[PDB]
Amino acid sequence: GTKERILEVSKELFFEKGYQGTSVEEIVKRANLSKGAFYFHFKSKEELITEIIERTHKKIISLFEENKEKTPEELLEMFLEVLYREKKVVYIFLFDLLCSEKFRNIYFEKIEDAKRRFEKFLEKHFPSKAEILSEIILGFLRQLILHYVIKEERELPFLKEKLREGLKLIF
Amino acid sequence: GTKERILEVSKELFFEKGYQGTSVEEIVKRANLSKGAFYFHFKSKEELITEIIERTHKKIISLFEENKEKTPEELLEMFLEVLYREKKVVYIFLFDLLCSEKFRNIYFEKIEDAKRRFEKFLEKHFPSKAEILSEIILGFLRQLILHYVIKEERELPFLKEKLREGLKLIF
Ligand SMILES: [Mg+2]
Ligand SMILES: [Mg+2]
Ligand SMILES: [Mg+2]
Ligand SMILES: [Mg+2]
């Protein structure tokens, strides 16, 4: 519906030119909507970006819930696939949240939540190493995204090959 | 000398309030120097931050050159110690270079150089795994710095314990 359309247009504009550099006026113009339509769904630009992040986080929560019986390697392959599909939001997450002073806490809150869930999953078969593995693997996944999605946009097969080999070495 | 004093004051101010939010006037005022003294050593604010990064990078180059005969675990322990001592510059590197549009390329150039050197070091005893290990280990080290130096400033012993256990698991 309209809320979905606003979210899509906002993700596009924030990806293209940042949160600070995009106004509600530009968003509604691009979406061919009135300001009233926007404010009916979002009370502020702040609520809007928070929802964008929240919805991608929810896909991550779903990923963990729906794949808790998979091997760590397969769960991680799925995690990378979702992040790649959501790469515009990943870009916003880094440049508009981590890089900000106001939203830095959200960036870390979401990472910590993903880390807690990943740890819980790993405690099942690697209890004494789950804490360590979560740091290593999240660090490795972030290195791959930063260099092969953010610095340069490589195609997904390349990232999957890198992830697969690194996880094989680790496990 | 004077150049060193300017560098120290600039690292402090950029750490405290960012590159964009710090002026040459504030730097020379804090250093009790004239603008002429500043311009004798730096032609611009851009040259100044570039030199700050270049000097910390040089400490990294030295680290690799001076410890090429150490075990990977010990070389990495030293790498973490230097990054921790240089944590104000690490903070500037992320928030003033990666987060910028103008200086993003420098952030990646330096990381790539560190990665190339680390890879070369690892090719000696783990040729077929050096490329993979460099991604994993740099990712892991970055995860530890981001969460335990940037998000919250933990003391060095904690970071070293985390690094030690993760490298033991990897190697
Ligand atoms: Mg598969
Ligand atoms: Mg698949
Ligand atoms: Mg030692
Ligand atoms: Mg030591």
TrEMBL record, chains A, B:
Residues 1-60 form the HTH tetR-type domain. Keywords: DNA-binding, Metal-binding, Transcription, Transcription regulation. Mg(2+) 2 binds at residues 77, 81. PROSITE patterns: HTH_TETR_1, HTH_TETR_2. The keyword Transcription applies. The keyword Metal-binding applies. InterPro entries: DNA-bd_HTH_TetR-type_CS, Homeodomain-like_sf, HTH-type_Tx_Regulator, HTH_TetR, TetR_AcrR1-like_C. It comes from the Bacteria. It holds the Pfam family TetR_C_42. This is Transcriptional regulator (TetR/AcrR family). It comes from Aquifex aeolicus (strain VF5).
